[PDB]
A paper describes a structure:
The ‘heat-resistant RNA-dependent ATPase’ [name] is a [name] box protein from [name].
In all structures where the C-terminal part is ordered, residues 493-498 fold back onto the outermost β-strand β2 of the RBD and physically block the RNA-binding site (cyan and orange in Figure 5A), with exception of the wild-type [name]_RBD structure. Mutants were grouped into three classes according to their Kd values: (i) with no or only a moderate (<5-fold) effect on RNA binding (K439A, R487A and R492A), (ii) with an intermediate (5- to 10-fold) effect on RNA binding ([name] and Y472A) and (iii) mutants that showed a >25-fold increase in the Kd values ([name], R444/449 A, K463A and ΔC-tail). Altogether it can be concluded that the C-terminus of [name]_RBD exhibits considerable conformational plasticity.
Residue numbers in the entry: 421 to 510
Write the structure that this text describes.
Amino acid sequence: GAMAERSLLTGEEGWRTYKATGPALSLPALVALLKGQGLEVGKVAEAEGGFYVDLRPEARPEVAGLRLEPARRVEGLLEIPSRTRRPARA
Ligand SMILES: [Cl-]
Ligand SMILES: [Cl-]
Ligand SMILES: [Cl-]
Ligand SMILES: [Zn+2]
Ligand SMILES: [Zn+2]
Ligand SMILES: [Zn+2]
């Protein structure tokens, strides 16, 4: 199980918002990387300081070389939080 958690991006329960702050990554590179660790990826939003990305509260994400920490504040958003497009929809 896991303690109850809410997205800082959307307010939806069932998500913990992380911030990805390095190294340089495109959004699709970040999402492919996380999916590659078997992580279910929720909504994402590009920001000035990096990317906000929702992961499941059970997750304890570890991606080598990536700084991925629980977000403290949502700021500097450049776009609405949205789910990544599946290839059929892209
Ligand atoms: Cl927990
Ligand atoms: Cl791409
Ligand atoms: Cl933060
Ligand atoms: Zn929290
Ligand atoms: Zn949802
Ligand atoms: Zn975008």
